[PDB]
Every structure is written in structure tokens, then in C-alpha cells.
Amino acid sequence: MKQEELKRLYKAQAIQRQLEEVEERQRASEIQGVRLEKALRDEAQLLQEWFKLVLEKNKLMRYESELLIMAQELELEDHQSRLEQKLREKMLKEESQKDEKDLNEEQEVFTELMQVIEQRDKLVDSLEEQRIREKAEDQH
Amino acid sequence: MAKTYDYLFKLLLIGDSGVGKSCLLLRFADDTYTESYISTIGVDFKIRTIELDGKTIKLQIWDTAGQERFRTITSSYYRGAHGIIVVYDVTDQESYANVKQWLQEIDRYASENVNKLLVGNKSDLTTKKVVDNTTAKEFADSLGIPFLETSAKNATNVEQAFMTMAAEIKKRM
Ligand SMILES: Nc1nc2c(ncn2[C@@H]2O[C@H](COP(=O)(O)OP(=O)(O)NP(=O)(O)O)[C@@H](O)[C@H]2O)c(=O)[nH]1
Ligand SMILES: [Mg+2]
């Protein structure tokens, strides 16, 4: 019995099927590229087909990289959920009652939780760091 | 699939423990709500992307613990924010008084031109309301800061609050 960790695994499953659909368009796209190189030898019909292929290849490249992050995001969101729960259980005790080994691992979960949240933020930032160069690339 | 966005805005929620900072974030980002009170451990954030005028903005909404034991943790995250919502409880006078100290926490640790917005949450409980809308409004005007009464419980105005917050960040920079 689960709760809106259900939303997490459905989204995960969706992203993996989206990665698989991209790795097949990537194989398809690269099979065409070798076809048009040999057709290099009107040629306007094939010159614009290879033009479309360049854009298409670049889109799948940008899209794969983003999907891979979205999958790391949900794995971190799941780890955060487990750490947060673990920490709360250790906080149910009153601090007089916890001996020194409690505080050490209670401290440890809290820092691990803060570190999981930091990598969530590093992924958010990296999404912009790659969004900022994509408009430097789309300036053409 | 892929989510393409125009700008990224970092937001912060701050205010006394209990005023409803986490429930507001839950209402806005996940469209849920809980009557259980679970104190925020340190900080957390959630994403929501919004359509404002021409553009798609991605809102990283940081949620801070209101308990003083975490203030040193929570003040790290003031600096890199574009926007900071100060939340108080309509049924608690002392939480509205303490708005002033949270504003001084902003001036101490935030960036000089951070955007600011005042929110009196829990408008639902008309019975035990104590802080009058006009006293708060009056306070907020002539800081040049906007103001709104919300209820995360029944959802009143919470999108408006976050949308207004986005508007004023876009005017700037
Ligand atoms: N009636 C009503 N109760 C609300 C509303 N928003 C929050 N609450 C209640 O107020 C309590 C505190 O909410 P919570 O979001 O946990 O507060 P907080 O500001 O995050 N506290 P902290 O700083 O400790 O994390 C919750 O039990 C919740 O049910 C609201 O709009 N109306
Ligand atoms: Mg909370």
C-alpha cells in the first residue's frame, strides 16, 4: 500500500519508455544519415531531407539528456522521502533519552537529507545551464 | 515529455512555524492539502511551471522551517532567491507582528532588490480571525509590497499569490 510515490513510479516508467522511443529514433536517424552520404554522389529533395535530419538528430540529443535528468530527479525525490521518514522516527524520542550513538546517526540522516536536496537543486540548475547554451546554439 | 521554459525564478516561503507555509506550497504545486501538521525539517523545494503573459516560467519554490532551531539553515537560501513570500496566520496576532522580524531577516541575508510579498493565510476560519485585512494591507502598502489573504485549505487566492509574485519578478531584471 503506497501513496503518491505512485505518481513517482508511473512518471519513472513513462520516462523510461520515452528514452526507449528516443534510442530507436536515434538508430533510425543514423541509418538515414549513411544513406544520404552515399546519395551525395534533383539533389534538392535529398539535401533538404538531410537538413531535416540534422535538426532532428540534435533534438533527440537534447531530449535524451533532459529525460536522463528527469529520471535522476525522481530517484533523488524517492531517496529524500526515505531519509525524511527515517529522520522523523528518530525525532519521536525526547533528547534526554537518546544516547550518543542516536544523535550521531540522527545527525547523519539530516546531513544526508540536506545533501539529497542539494543534488535536486544541482539538477534544477544544470537544466538551466543546458537551457542557456541551447539559446546560444539557436542563435545561428 | 520535455518541459521547455522561458525563465527560472527561485522563490522562498518564510514565516512563523504553523502559519501554513508548507500547505500553501502543497496546494500550489501538487493541488493537495493535509490537516496534519508536520514541521518542516530545514528546507525543501518543489517545482511548478506557470503561464504568465507571453512566457513559461519555472518556479523553484523553497519551503523553510519556521522554528528557530533551523534559522541558520534556512538563511543560507535567502541570498540566491529572486522572490520571498512572508506568510502569517490570520488567527494569530503574534505571527503578524513577527512579519516585521522576517522582513529584517530578508534585509540582512537576501539580495538588495529581492522581491517581497505578504500573505495572510488561513482565511477560511472567519471565526477566530484576529488580524484585519486593512491593517495588514495598510502595513504592506508603503513598503511597496503587495498583499493577499489566502486559504490553502479551500484554495482561495493561492495561485493568485504566486502569480503576483512572478509578475513583479518579471518587471525587474
Ligand atoms: N484552516 C486552515 N488551516 C491551514 C491552512 N494552511 C495550513 N493550515 C493548517 O495549519 C497547520 C500548519 O501548516 P504547515 O503548512 O505545516 O505550517 P508551516 O508554516 O509549514 N510550519 P513550519 O514552519 O513548522 O513548517 C497544519 O496543520 C494545517 O492543517 C489554511 O489555509 N487553513
Ligand atoms: Mg511545514
Numbering used by the authors:
A (entry chain A): 533 to 573, 582 to 680
B (entry chain B): 1 to 173
Which passages does the manuscript contain on this structure?
Rab proteins, the biggest subfamily within the superfamily of small GTPases, are major regulators of vesicular trafficking in eukaryotic cells. One such family of effector proteins that was reported to link Rab proteins and the cytoskeleton is the Mical (molecules interacting with CasL) family. In this publication, we present a thorough biochemical and structural analysis of a Rab effector domain termed bivalent Mical/EHBP Rab binding (bMERB) domain. The results show that the domains probably constitute a Rab8-effector family involved in endosomal trafficking, and the Rab-binding specificity can be well explained from the 3-dimensional structures of complexes determined in this work.
Interestingly, whereas Rab1 contains a glutamate near the N-terminus (Glu4), all Rab8 family members contain one or (in the case of Rab10) two lysine residues in this region that point towards a negatively charged patch in Mical-cL. We therefore tested whether these N-terminal residues of the Rab proteins might determine the specificity of bMERB domains towards Rab8 and its homologues rather than Rab1. We constructed a chimera of Rab1 containing the 4 N-terminal aa of Rab8, thus exchanging the negatively charged glutamate for a positively charged lysine. The x-ray crystallographic structure of this Rab1 chimera (termed Rab1R8N) in complex with Mical-cL clearly showed that the helices 1 and 2 move closer and adopt a similar conformation as observed in the structures of Rab8:Mical-cL and Rab10:Mical-cL. Additionally, ITC measurements showed that the chimera had an approximately five-fold increased binding affinity compared to Rab1. In contrast to Rab1, the chimera Rab1R8N bound both EHBP1 and EHBP1L1 in aSEC experiments, thus clearly indicating that the N-terminus is important for the interaction and contributes to the observed specificity of bMERB domains towards Rab proteins. However, after mutating the 4 N-terminal residues of Rab1 to the corresponding sequence of Rab8 (the resulting chimera is called Rab1R8N), the structure of Rab1R8N:Mical-cL shows a similar conformation of α-helices 1 and 2 as in the structure of Rab8:Mical-cL. (c) Consistently, ITC measurements show that the affinity of binding increases approximately five-fold after mutating the N-terminal residues (Rab1:Mical-cL: KD = 5.2 µM; Rab1R8N:Mical-cL: KD = 1.1 µM; Rab8:Mical-cL: KD = 0.23 µM). In this regard, we showed that the N-terminal residues preceding the RabSF1 motif contribute to this specificity, an observation that has previously not been made in other Rab:effector interactions.
